[PDB]
Amino acid sequence: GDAPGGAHMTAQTVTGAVAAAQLGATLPHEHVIFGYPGYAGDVTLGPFDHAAALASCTETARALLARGIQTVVDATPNGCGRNPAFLREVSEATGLQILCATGFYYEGGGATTYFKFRASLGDAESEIYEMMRTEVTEGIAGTGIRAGVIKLASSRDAITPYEQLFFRAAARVQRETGVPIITHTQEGQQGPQQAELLTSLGADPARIMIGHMDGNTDPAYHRETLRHGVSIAFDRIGLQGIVGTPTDAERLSVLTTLLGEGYADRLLLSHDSIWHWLGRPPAIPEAALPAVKDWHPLHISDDILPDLRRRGITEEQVGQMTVGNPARLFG
Amino acid sequence: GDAPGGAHMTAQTVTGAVAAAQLGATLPHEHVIFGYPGYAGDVTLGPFDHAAALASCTETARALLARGIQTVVDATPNGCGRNPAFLREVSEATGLQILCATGFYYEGGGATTYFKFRASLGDAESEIYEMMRTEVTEGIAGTGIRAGVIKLASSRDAITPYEQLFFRAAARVQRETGVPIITHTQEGQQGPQQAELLTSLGADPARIMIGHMDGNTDPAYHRETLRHGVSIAFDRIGLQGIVGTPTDAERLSVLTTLLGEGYADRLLLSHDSIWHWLGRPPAIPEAALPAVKDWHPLHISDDILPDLRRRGITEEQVGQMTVGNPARLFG
Ligand SMILES: [Co+2]
Ligand SMILES: [Co+2]
Ligand SMILES: [Co+2]
Ligand SMILES: [Co+2]
Numbered sequence: 001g002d003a004p005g006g007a008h009m010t011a012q013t014v015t016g017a018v019a020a021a022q023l024g025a026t027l028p029h030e031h032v033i034f035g036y037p038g039y040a041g042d043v044t045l046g047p048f049d050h051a052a053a054l055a056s057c058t059e060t061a062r063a064l065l066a067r068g069i070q071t072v073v074d075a076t077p078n079g080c081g082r083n084p085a086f087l088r089e090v091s092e093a094t095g096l097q098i099l100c101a102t103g104f105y106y107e108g109g110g111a112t113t114y115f116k117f118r119a120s121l122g123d124a125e126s127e128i129y130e131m132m133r134t135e136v137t138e139g140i141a142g143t144g145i146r147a148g149v150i151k152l153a154s155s156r157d158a159i160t161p162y163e164q165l166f167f168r169a170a171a172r173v174q175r176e177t178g179v180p181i182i183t184h185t186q187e188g189q190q191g192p193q194q195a196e197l198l199t200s201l202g203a204d205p206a207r208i209m210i211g212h213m214d215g216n217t218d219p220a221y222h223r224e225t226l227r228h229g230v231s232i233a234f235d236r237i238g239l240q241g242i243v244g245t246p247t248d249a250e251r252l253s254v255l256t257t258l259l260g261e262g263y264a265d266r267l268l269l270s271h272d273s274i275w276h277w278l279g280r281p282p283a284i285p286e287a288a289l290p291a292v293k294d295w296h297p298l299h300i301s302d303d304i305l306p307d308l309r310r311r312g313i314t315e316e317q318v319g320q321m322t323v324g325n326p327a328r329l330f331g
Numbered sequence: 332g333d334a335p336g337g338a339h340m341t342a343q344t345v346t347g348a349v350a351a352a353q354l355g356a357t358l359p360h361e362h363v364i365f366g367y368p369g370y371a372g373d374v375t376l377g378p379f380d381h382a383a384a385l386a387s388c389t390e391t392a393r394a395l396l397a398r399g400i401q402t403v404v405d406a407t408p409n410g411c412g413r414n415p416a417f418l419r420e421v422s423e424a425t426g427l428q429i430l431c432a433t434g435f436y437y438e439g440g441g442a443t444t445y446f447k448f449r450a451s452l453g454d455a456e457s458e459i460y461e462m463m464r465t466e467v468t469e470g471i472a473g474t475g476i477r478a479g480v481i482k483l484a485s486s487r488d489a490i491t492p493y494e495q496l497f498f499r500a501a502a503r504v505q506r507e508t509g510v511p512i513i514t515h516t517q518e519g520q521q522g523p524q525q526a527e528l529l530t531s532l533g534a535d536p537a538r539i540m541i542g543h544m545d546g547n548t549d550p551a552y553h554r555e556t557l558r559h560g561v562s563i564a565f566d567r568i569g570l571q572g573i574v575g576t577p578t579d580a581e582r583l584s585v586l587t588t589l590l591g592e593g594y595a596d597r598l599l600l601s602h603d604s605i606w607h608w609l610g611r612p613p614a615i616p617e618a619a620l621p622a623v624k625d626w627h628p629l630h631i632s633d634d635i636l637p638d639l640r641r642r643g644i645t646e647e648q649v650g651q652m653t654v655g656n657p658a659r660l661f662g
Contacts, residue, residue, distance in 0.1 A: 038445025
């Protein structure tokens with residue numbers, strides 16, 4: 001099929017290099033810990049309880065392994081609580097393999113002030129390129145822990161000029177190292193534009209996963225994106241009818257259509273769940289309880305897969321999505 | 332004149348309570364360390380060199396004392412690098428008294444994602460109120476170091492709904508504790524609106540300093556703001572013709588007019604300087620060199636004051652601005 005072509009390094013997890021064959025079933029987009037930009041400024045009342053986060057996270061890790069999930073890809077942006085050392089902790093404690101990311105979030109929800117300022121003063125793209133390259137090849141913050149993927153994100157109405165700085169830096173790092181790229185699309189838009197842009201810049205589509213594609217329910221939009229040869233992920237499975245999100249029933253309808261059209265090799269599945277929130281614990285209005293009810297990392301293993309199988313999807317298609325595709329994209 | 336009326340606590344500096352009479356000459360708006368939101372996500376290439384920052388900061392501290400400045404008010408927002416423990420370090424090492432702030436920055440340049448999200452889920456104002464109240468009365472991040480002022484900020488075109496959450500929480504904390512409030516106005520606008528809003532909410536104008544008023548060169552705008560009984564600060568003195576900023580000559584023209592109209596008791600002067608930047612050191616395009624040439628904390632002491640005196644301003648007016656006003660506002 002379409003194999004990764006160009007520079008290449010074996011999958012880097014927070015605990016070191018891992019062979020593609022050892023990745024096993026994988027959730028390509030989750031967040032062990034996560035905090036929206038600003039969470040740190042609420043440190044007095046919402047401090048990080050490391051002991052509790054570690055207990056809870058490892059328990060979630062252990063439950064994933066119970067389900068045969070050997071690997072999780074943590075997509076947390078550098079300014080949203082990324083903590084490679086903590087992920088290494090969670091990994092060494094449970095045996096769950098974790099890959100972390102390098103990247104900043106979309107303009108609308110990221111810690112954008114910094115690079116927007118540096119971009120006004122000089123060559124920010126080049127500076128973003130050096131950070132990503134260093135994090136992928138040498139390590140994050142002096143820990144030696146390397147990023148196994150680059151995380152890119154765009155806004156709803158366009159991939160903004162600020163966002164494009166990151167897309168150009170990542171493309172260059174991609175070309176030079178072969179590292180995988182995973183993305184965020186805001187509210188079901190810009191999937192095709194991200195794929196076009198990344199490929200146009202020389203990024204290997206065999207190493208690109210356009211995310212939150214489940215955010216759009218017109219399969220035409222998905223096919224237009226797949227036309228580029230990149231993989232696409234229904235990665236907010238379980239987050240229903242909230243923040244623009246469709247219902248899982250809607251996602252499944254699109255998914256089985258795409259599956260029935262032969263796209264298994266290019267479909268990945270995830271929850272975009274957060275195991276432990278940073279800042280003060282989120283206050284969940286009762287009315288939103290159903291929207292987040294299945295939004296946890298065991299939902300696909302326990303509800304989705306069995307539901308695709310009973311719908312006609314095959315053990316082979318499911319293994320392609322959950323093991324085949326990840327092995328090739330990140331391995 | 333107009334003395335602080337209501338609840339009251341003695342000036343809290345990062346090293347403890349200080350009598351109003353011991354504040355001495357003060358710079359009401361500076362930043363020992365500062366980083367635009369996102370700086371932390373650039374930690375791999377732009378890590379904090381604590382030894383160098385401490386050496387440099389204390390040297391700046393020592394130079395301020397050489398000039399008789401006994402106190403500095405650090406206006407750094409919770410998500411812009413605020414570090415009470417480091418300020419205590421700089422203070423205990425030199426004897427320079429430092430007050431730190433509690434508050435988030437304006438929507439356009441702050442770490443806004445967090446509270447914008449919490450506001451969508453619940454009562455963020457109340458949450459912001461608890462943080463500010465706890466930081467002012469008990470301490471920041473478990474250090475015991477209390478905030479001596481609340482920092483509020485608004486955008487250019489309006490005090491946005493997100494910003495108003497902070498203005499309402501601060502007003503309440505102001506009413507209950509008497510703590511001073513200092514603000515940021517973006518590009519010479521919203522000074523009058525901030526003053527109106529804060530007073531309308533029950534905040535004591537004798538404890539309110541509307542900042543970056545030097546950003547507007549129409550004295551009419553300043554008088555309209557002073558009409559509220561609040562103090563106003565020309566606090567970006569030295570930052571010239573850049574980021575919308577006027578020249579110092581322009582600021583001085585407005586200042587002597589206001590001074591000649593009897594407003595000394597309500598005028599404060601500062602630089603809004605940054606002693607040590609967080610993130611990778613700022614790259615200064617040569618063309619901007621003159622704009623930042625006098626932008627350091629010795630500029631007012633060495634250039635401005637002597638320049639107001641030779642312009643006719645009196646030793647008494649200068650002492651009112653630099654010692655009288657601070658004593659009353661923060662003491
Ligand atoms: Co996302
Ligand atoms: Co995510
Ligand atoms: Co400001
Ligand atoms: Co400032």
